[PDB]
């Protein structure tokens, strides 16, 4: 097949002009969508804050208006998912992955409205869920919509425009352009076959997405950590250790999300009325814990810089970690619309801090800063649970800008993905798709 290759080599990287321009518009819209979704979430959390002050005398009515304000918003988000687009429940990365395998539909006329408005309900109430899940599904659906509006034909167009929408989606959620591309190239792509996803086109959409985000967000960074210290060579083996601890934890957390999806299904049986009521109680618990112990609830981005600076006690970090493991499962396994990606950065940080502070007191000769271990651990639950380590590493690098830590970040991530493989765990997005494709057949 040599003369075939000579021809193909000579025809490499000539994506059709139409796909490239359309990639541009897909990115722009995904950017504007993500910006809007981001401001919408914030505006409701505010309304909720200003409610708690018209009510800040009567501590009992305080805890009540915290609970019902988030209960109402939660149910609303649960309800529109079950009523009009059930595949907008949970994250949405597994379904956009399925769409890329050509085994799940991109029902953009229904998911766009429910995922956007349903996510605002669940995130805006202060549930432990992220923007990533929403913005990538919303971004994929936006890809499909542009495809259907302009009736572009071919496998290339359908796969690329679907890929760039979910890439521009992650980029715009984190101000993280390199992470978005890599998430497609390492995780979301069809993993067992070649595809004609143009990468140059995914690149164009990511740019425009990221430019839209900078237009409405500049001057303030998602996570500001400052510059931490360097890592001496004789410190590296400690990051490997930390990796191995993430590698054992990764899969165990994956059991919990899945079996927790099972358990909480038992509660409502599948009934949209018991279900919406269940999410109303989970939502009320978060908006309540949001007042009574904020680090137990919410997306968790707030406590990342705090934990990195060593300003939490070890007692607090253990408490937060347990609690947040708990509230993270309850919210994502419940099937509320919204991601688990960003709360895993939090869980990783908190854990890595606690390792760091043990490492500082065991080795004063190392001159450790617990913060370097928090930075190594941030993308570590990502590496051992969803097994996209190159994406977590580039994402953490883009968000915290401590490139001098690249080696302990790599090392921690690979140990996590190595010990997750070696202890019998699977990529969580793939094991969520697989279970979803396994009852889209067992009903026959």
């Amino acid at each position, epitope marked *: 097949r040599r003369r075939q290759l000579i021809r193909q080599l000579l025809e490499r990287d000539k994506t059709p002009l139409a796909i490239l321009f359309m990639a541009a518009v897909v990115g722009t819209l995904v950017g504007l969508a993500a910006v809007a979704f981001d401001k919408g979430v914030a505006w409701l959390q505010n309304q909720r804050m200003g409610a708690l002050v018209h009510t800040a005398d009567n501590y009992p009515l305080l805890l009540t208006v915290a609970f019902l304000c988030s209960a109402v918003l939660a149910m609303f988000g649960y309800f529109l998912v079950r009523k009009y687009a059930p595949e907008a429940g949970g994250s949405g990365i597994p379904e956009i992955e399925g769409a890329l395998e050509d085994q799940r539909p991109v029902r953009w006329w229904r998911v766009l409205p429910v995922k956007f408005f349903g996510g605002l309900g669940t995130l805006g109430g202060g549930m432990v869920l992220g923007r990533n899940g929403p913005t990538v599904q919303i971004g994929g659906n936006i890809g499909r919509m542009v495809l259907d509006i302009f009736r572009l034909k071919g496998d290339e167009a359908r796969h690329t425009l679907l890929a760039t929408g979910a890439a521009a989606g992650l980029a715009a959620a984190f101000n993280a352009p390199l992470a978005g591309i890599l998430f497609i190239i390492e995780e979301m792509r069809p993993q067992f076959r070649y595809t004609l996803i143009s990468i140059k086109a995914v690149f164009i959409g990511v740019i425009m997405s990221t430019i839209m985000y900078r237009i409405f967000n500049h001057e303030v960074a998602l996570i500001d950590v400052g510059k931490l210290s360097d890592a*001496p*060579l*004789n*410190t590296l083996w400690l990051y490997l250790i930390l990796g191995i601890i993430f590698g054992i934890f990764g899969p165990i957390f994956n059991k919990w999300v899945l079996g927790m999806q099972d358990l909480l299904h038992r509660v409502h049986g599948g009934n949209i009325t018991k279900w919406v009521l269940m999410g109303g109680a989970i939502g009320g618990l978060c908006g309540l814990l949001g007042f009574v112990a904020p680090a137990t609830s919410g997306g968790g981005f707030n406590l990342i810089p705090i934990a990195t600076a*060593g300003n939490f006690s070890m007692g607090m970090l253990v408490f937060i970690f347990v609690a947040r493991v708990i509230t993270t499962l309850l919210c994502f396994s419940s099937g509320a619309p919204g991601g688990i990606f960003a709360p895993m950065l939090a869980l990783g940080t908190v854990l890595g801090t606690a390792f760091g502070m043990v490492a500082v007191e065991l*080795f*004063p*000769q190392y*001159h450790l800063e617990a913060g370097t271990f928090a930075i190594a651990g941030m993308g570590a639950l990502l590496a051992a649970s969803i097994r996209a380590p190159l994406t977590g590493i580039i994402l953490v690098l883009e968000m915290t800008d401590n490139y001098q830590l690249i080696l302990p970040m790599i090392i921690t991530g690979l140990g996590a993905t190595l010990l997750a493989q070696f202890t019998g765990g699977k990529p969580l997005y793939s094991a969520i798709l697989a279970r979803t494709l396994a009852k889209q057949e067992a009903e026959q």
Partner: antibody
Amino acid sequence: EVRLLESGGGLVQPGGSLKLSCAASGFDYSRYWMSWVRQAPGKGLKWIGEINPVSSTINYTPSLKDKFIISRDNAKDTLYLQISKVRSEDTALYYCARLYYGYGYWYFDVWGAGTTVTVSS
Amino acid sequence: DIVLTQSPAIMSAAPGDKVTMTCSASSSVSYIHWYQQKSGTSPKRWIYDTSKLTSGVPVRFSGSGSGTSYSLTINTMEAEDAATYYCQQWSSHPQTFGGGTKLEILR
């Protein structure tokens, strides 16, 4: 150049206190751990203590509760050493050092000239 | 703490001649440093990580060793090599210097 200029060492009466000062010039003095080492008359080098750039960690040699107090003010770019209940054992040349590492086994990167403490009635 | 003991506590040697001092530890130690001090002068970092020369340290100088015993060496002594040579460990905490080795000219 990179300069360490320590001052504040003089004659002090037994049981007194004193506050030595190291003035850093010619390098970003944030970023660096700073250290005190002293040399008693005709004797070897003895480590006092170290402070990290954010004063969040300060270690001292195995030696009594509020004997030494190391602190830094990275704004004026100067390192400090308070000595208390000073006895003649504290008669020494006092060195201020910038700390670094190669493979990660920490060494005394650059030293100042010293100041001499004499404690005597 | 780790005790480091430098061996020929004082010693003399003619110029253009091969000198060798020792450092020895109560326990095992890793990547030892060596500082050179002339009277009236700040100590100068001389050799680090048991074997590595500092920027400017002439090539005649060299270190070696492992575990519990280490060494400094000057293949061809010069005159400006007259000084005191302190070995230093931070493999353990807290870090400890040696007693010193004073090296003076022979004439």
